[PDB]
Amino acid sequence: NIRPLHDRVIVKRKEVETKSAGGIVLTGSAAAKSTRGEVLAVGNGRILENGEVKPLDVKVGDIVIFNDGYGVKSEKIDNEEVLIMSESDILAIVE
Amino acid sequence: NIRPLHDRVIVKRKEVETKSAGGIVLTGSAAAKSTRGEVLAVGNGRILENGEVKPLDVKVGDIVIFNDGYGVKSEKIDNEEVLIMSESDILAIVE
Amino acid sequence: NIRPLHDRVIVKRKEVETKSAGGIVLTGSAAAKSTRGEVLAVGNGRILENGEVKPLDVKVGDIVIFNDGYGVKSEKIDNEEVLIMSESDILAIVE
Amino acid sequence: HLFTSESVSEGHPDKIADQISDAVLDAILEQDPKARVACETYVKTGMVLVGGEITTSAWVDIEEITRNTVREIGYVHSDMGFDANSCAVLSAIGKQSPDINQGVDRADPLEQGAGDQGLMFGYATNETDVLMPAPITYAHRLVQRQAEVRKNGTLPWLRPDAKSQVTFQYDDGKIVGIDAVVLSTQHSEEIDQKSLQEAVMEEIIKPILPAEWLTSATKFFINPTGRFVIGGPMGDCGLTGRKIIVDTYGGMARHGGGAFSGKDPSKVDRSAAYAARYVAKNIVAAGLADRCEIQVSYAIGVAEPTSIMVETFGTEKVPSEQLTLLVREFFDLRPYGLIQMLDLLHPIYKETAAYGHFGREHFPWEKTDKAQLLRDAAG
Amino acid sequence: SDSKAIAQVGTISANSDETVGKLIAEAMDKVGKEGVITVEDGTGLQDELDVVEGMQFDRGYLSPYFINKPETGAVELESPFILLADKKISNIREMLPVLEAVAKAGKPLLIIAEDVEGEALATLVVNTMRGIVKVAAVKAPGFGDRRKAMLQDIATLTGGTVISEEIGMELEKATLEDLGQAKRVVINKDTTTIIDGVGEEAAIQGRVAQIRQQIEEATSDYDREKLQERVAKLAGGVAVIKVGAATEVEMKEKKARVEDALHATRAAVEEGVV
Numbered sequence: 001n002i003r004p005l006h007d008r009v010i011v012k013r014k015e016v017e018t019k020s021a022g023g024i025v026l027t028g029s030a031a032a033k034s035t036r037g038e039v040l041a042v043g044n045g046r047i048l049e050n051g052e053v054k055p056l057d058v059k060v061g062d063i064v065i066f067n068d069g070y071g072v073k074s075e076k077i078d079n080e081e082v083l084i085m086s087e088s089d090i091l092a093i094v095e
Numbered sequence: 096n097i098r099p100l101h102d103r104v105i106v107k108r109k110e111v112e113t114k115s116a117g118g119i120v121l122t123g124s125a126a127a128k129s130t131r132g133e134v135l136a137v138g139n140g141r142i143l144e145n146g147e148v149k150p151l152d153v154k155v156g157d158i159v160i161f162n163d164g165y166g167v168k169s170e171k172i173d174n175e176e177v178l179i180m181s182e183s184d185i186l187a188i189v190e
Numbered sequence: 191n192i193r194p195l196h197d198r199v200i201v202k203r204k205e206v207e208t209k210s211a212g213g214i215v216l217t218g219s220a221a222a223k224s225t226r227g228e229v230l231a232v233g234n235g236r237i238l239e240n241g242e243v244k245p246l247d248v249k250v251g252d253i254v255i256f257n258d259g260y261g262v263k264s265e266k267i268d269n270e271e272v273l274i275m276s277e278s279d280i281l282a283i284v285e
Numbered sequence: 286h287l288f289t290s291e292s293v294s295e296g297h298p299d300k301i302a303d304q305i306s307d308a309v310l311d312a313i314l315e316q317d318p319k320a321r322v323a324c325e326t327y328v329k330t331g332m333v334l335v336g337g338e339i340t341t342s343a344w345v346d347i348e349e350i351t352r353n354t355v356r357e358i359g360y361v362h363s364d365m366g367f368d369a370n371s372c373a374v375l376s377a378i379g380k381q382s383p384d385i386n387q388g389v390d391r392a393d394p395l396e397q398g399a400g401d402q403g404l405m406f407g408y409a410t411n412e413t414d415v416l417m418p419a420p421i422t423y424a425h426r427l428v429q430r431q432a433e434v435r436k437n438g439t440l441p442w443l444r445p446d447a448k449s450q451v452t453f454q455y456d457d458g459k460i461v462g463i464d465a466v467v468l469s470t471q472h473s474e475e476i477d478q479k480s481l482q483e484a485v486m487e488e489i490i491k492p493i494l495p496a497e498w499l500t501s502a503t504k505f506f507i508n509p510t511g512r513f514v515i516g517g518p519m520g521d522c523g524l525t526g527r528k529i530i531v532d533t534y535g536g537m538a539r540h541g542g543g544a545f546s547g548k549d550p551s552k553v554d555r556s557a558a559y560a561a562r563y564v565a566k567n568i569v570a571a572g573l574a575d576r577c578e579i580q581v582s583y584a585i586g587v588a589e590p591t592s593i594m595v596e597t598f599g600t601e602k603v604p605s606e607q608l609t610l611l612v613r614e615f616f617d618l619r620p621y622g623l624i625q626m627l628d629l630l631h632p633i634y635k636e637t638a639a640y641g642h643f644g645r646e647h648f649p650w651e652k653t654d655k656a657q658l659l660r661d662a663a664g
Numbered sequence: 665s666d667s668k669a670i671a672q673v674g675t676i677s678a679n680s681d682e683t684v685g686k687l688i689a690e691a692m693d694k695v696g697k698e699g700v701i702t703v704e705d706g707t708g709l710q711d712e713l714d715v716v717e718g719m720q721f722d723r724g725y726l727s728p729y730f731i732n733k734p735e736t737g738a739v740e741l742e743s744p745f746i747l748l749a750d751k752k753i754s755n756i757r758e759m760l761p762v763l764e765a766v767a768k769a770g771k772p773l774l775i776i777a778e779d780v781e782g783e784a785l786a787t788l789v790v791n792t793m794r795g796i797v798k799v800a801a802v803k804a805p806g807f808g809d810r811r812k813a814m815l816q817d818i819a820t821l822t823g824g825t826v827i828s829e830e831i832g833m834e835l836e837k838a839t840l841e842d843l844g845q846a847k848r849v850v851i852n853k854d855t856t857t858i859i860d861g862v863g864e865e866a867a868i869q870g871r872v873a874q875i876r877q878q879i880e881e882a883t884s885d886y887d888r889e890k891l892q893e894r895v896a897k898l899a900g901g902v903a904v905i906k907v908g909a910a911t912e913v914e915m916k917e918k919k920a921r922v923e924d925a926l927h928a929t930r931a932a933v934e935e936g937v938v
Contacts, residue, residue: 022764023796027786029757035170053144057100057139065097065179073105080118082112091179092099092136116269122832130265148239152234159191160274162263173194185191186263186274187200480722487808501883 002077005036007046007056007087011064013037036094037064037083046087056087063094097172099176102141104153106161108132133158135169135177143179149184158189192267194274197236198246199248201256214245226284227273228253242267246277255285289452290420294428294470294605295358295639296445296516298395298523302326305335306525306547307638308354309347315551316343322549323353323380328523330366336377337547340385347376359435362522363389365444365471366519370534392633393542397621399583407561407579408538409424409569412460416566417644419460420453421535423494425641427451427468440484443471445514455486467506470517482507500535532642533558538578545642550629552585553620560623562643564616564648568595569654573608573663575600581618590618603663670929673937676930678921687713688929690924691903698872698935699903700896704904705915711756711922717904719821720857721805721814726780726839728900729789730800730851738852740802744772746844746858747834748819748826750812754781756788758835766839767797774849776818778804778811799847802856810890817898820871822846823863872899 004010016031039062045053058064072085099105108129113120137155140148167180203224208215224226232250235243248254256279264273293300305326313320324337335347355369362368409416427449435443452469453460472481484522486505533540543554550556561579569577580594595608617626627649645651667689691701694715716858731739745766766773775787780801791797804811819826824844847860872895879891896902907922913931
């Protein structure tokens with residue numbers, strides 16, 4: 001069990017797709033890294049200059065769109081890679 | 096349905112026009128990417144320093160003028176290219 | 191017609207004069223790009239930290255002196271180039 | 286008249302040896318501004334030998350330079366019998382000299398004496414834009430084109446070994462056409478003979494030689510015996526300094542025979558020839574003559590040059606006395622004076638090792654900045 | 665005009681050798697009047713004649729996984745498409761629309777490009793193996809301006825349009841109107857043959873007339889031979905005569921005699937006999 005601190009969020013990204021708008025199958029460098037995932041646990045909240053905590057807008061079990069970068073760190077837990085990132089890396093909520 | 100977080104808006108840029116003040120057709124480097132588009136979904140609002148939320152100044156259906164850059168992110172939704180970018184990255188509203 | 195958002199104004203630069211301080215007609219790179227223009231519309235106003243609006247000092251129809259740089263963006267409207275710029279790039283007002 | 290010039294590619298063992306010697310010279314010069322270098326290289330099947338006399342205050346290991354240099358040509362496989370990493374390089378260089386403290390004292394650098402006795406020559410003609418004899422120039426360009434295509438990857442089955450022969454005819458002392466073009470190159474065994482000549486003539490022969498100089502009588506020869514797969518150091522002995530005639534002018538100009546590669550600028554056997562070409566190119570670019578040569582003579586242990594002679598083949602627009610007067614009072618033919626004004630003490634001898642020491646605009650000795658001044662003076 | 669006179673001329677022109685005269689007459693009758701006959705040294709002990717119908721170029725399949733008929737070691741495509749490209753290929757992103765469109769139909773497709781890198785080869789071969797779309801890839805034959813000329817020739821004969829980057833045409837916007845058609849295509853390790861293209865005739869006559877008039881201004885007989893071969897390839901047939909001799913010296917002698925007979929028969933057909 002992992003509990004994120006402050007406004008950070010731990011997610012797992014979906015597997016890369018094989019079919020692309022039809023029967024065309026992409027292998028190797030043709031299929032890029034997935035740019036979507038599901039959130040497993042959510043942080044307590046962001047620390048304000050006042051000192052209060054603002055709860056994060058994302059909730060457990062949702063689907064988010066995020067941009068990979070220097071802020072997103074990849075950690076391997078239970079022989080499974082998960083992504084730890086701040087809320088600012090999350091762009092939108094799917095459905 | 097895709098809804099952004101905080102002060103982000105999703106846009107779909109207009110098609111690249113070939114005709115330019117006449118029947119002449121521009122190809123290659125003559126015509127560049129468009130810089131106008133319409134918003135599809137609007138974020139809830141920016142988060143203030145104290146903790147309040149401010150509604151955005153863009154309504155759904157308006158045509159916006161923006162500048163493509165590092166902050167603008169391109170994502171494929173429903174096999175359609177849309178741009179996820181902040182509210183501060185748009186310049187003006189047409190009409 | 192367009193209207194800017196927040197702390198932005200739209201200006202149009204006047205034509206550069208050829209005969210400078212006499213009959214000497216200047217051609218080529220000597221006739222530098224004009225650094226003065228007239229505002230076409232005024233933005234709503236900058237958003238303060240608390241969320242209030244500060245009305246812009248520049249009024250529509252005035253003449254402004256600015257500096258050309260990276261922050262100034264050009265847009266082709268009605269086949270007539272204009273400049274999209276923030277109030278921070280406005281140096282002074284003529285008369 | 287019918288004259289033929291022959292050029293060779295960078296994959297040949299002698300050209301490999303020449304490249305190694307100049308690569309070491311640039312490395313030594315970069316570390317030591319005022320070093321003394323006189324080196325030679327020998328290459329054979331799987332064994333590489335280096336020797337000579339190099340006196341310098343710095344130390345350089347030759348192994349990493351040799352592997353880097355050989356890899357540049359493309360010897361990265363064992364199919365041709367020579368591989369960069371699998372080969373072995375031994376050093377037979379005396380890094381120290383007894384005369385390092387006895388002669389350290391100097392009186393005046395501007396009055397340095399020549400260390401060798403002999404006479405050197407220059408040459409320049411307006412037949413080509415690069416002010417060089419045409420048959421040798423186009424022979425170098427052909428093998429240069431082959432290497433560029435080979436490096437580009439469009440022709441991956443080509444091998445570094447290549448040789449070209451170009452024949453030119455002259456009518457009333459002017460070029461009127463191209464007679465015969467020969468390009469001998471090594472290729473891989475996968476491609477058959479018939480497809481081989483088609484690629485080389487249409488992508489190397491065609492876009493290099495001028496089209497307006499090619500007539501219906503031109504004959505193209507490719508792979509005379511029919512199979513040039515065998516090549517590399519296995520098929521021929523390798524040593525340094527055996528085709529100086531090919532590097533300098535191709536035989537159109539009388540040469541002293543002094544070896545160029547592996548020699549420091551201090552020795553006049555190399556630098557003084559560079560100055561003669563620089564003077565000859567300068568004096569012909571001004572339009573004072575159609576062709577000109579500079580004969581500079583030096584004596585061992587003698588500072589002032591013994592004699593300077595200029596010959597023009599009767600094409601001079603001014604008397605030869607004026608031509609001799611200008612070069613004396615406008616060019617510093619001092620053995621150290623020409624060093625300073627040609628600023629050769631820079632690591633620039635790697636590219637000069639292959640494809641001819643002369644005929645490239647970027648070389649310091651190939652500049653024509655002094656042509657305008659001489660035209661005004663003689664006019 | 666008759667084949668008997670042509671055979672007699674060929675026999676007389678080859679030191680009274682009836683076999684070579686008869687062979688040349690038969691080859692000329694088979695190929696016709698607008699065609700190319702050439703002589704190369706063979707390997708057997710007796711002369712043989714080989715004739716090629718249609719057009720073919722010396723370019724084979726890129727990968728050995730495209731062959732659906734291992735018995736002959738060659739791949740056969742029935743009523744396929746033809747895609748023509750001059751640009752180098754290293755990514756598949758530019759062919760998603762065309763491949764999905766032709767997979768929506770089922771009948772095969774052929775790619776003629778100057779070169780395709782392994783990244784696109786991987787997806788092409790995996791798609792062919794998984795049984796979704798049947799495609800084949802062959803390099804563009806020749807090099808230089810001749811390569812584009814013969815690409816245009818193939819485009820004209822197959823009833824399609826070439827896709828060139830320098831003319832401001834991109835492969836992403838290509839559709840079925842830019843793809844040609846053919847009755848059958850046979851590709852082996854070294855040759856690719858297009859059988860019974862569906863191009864328009866008047867374009868064929870225009871192209872052959874253009875190349876024929878371009879022949880005249882050529883100053884080297886090598887260029888004349890190449891353009892005549894192009895004319896024969898686009899319209900007509902091409903035949904090769906493989907002379908056979910035990911020893912190289914006899915090989916050269918027989919080759920010279922056959923070439924002389926060929927020239928004499930050509931001249932006799934052109935002007936007449938006395």
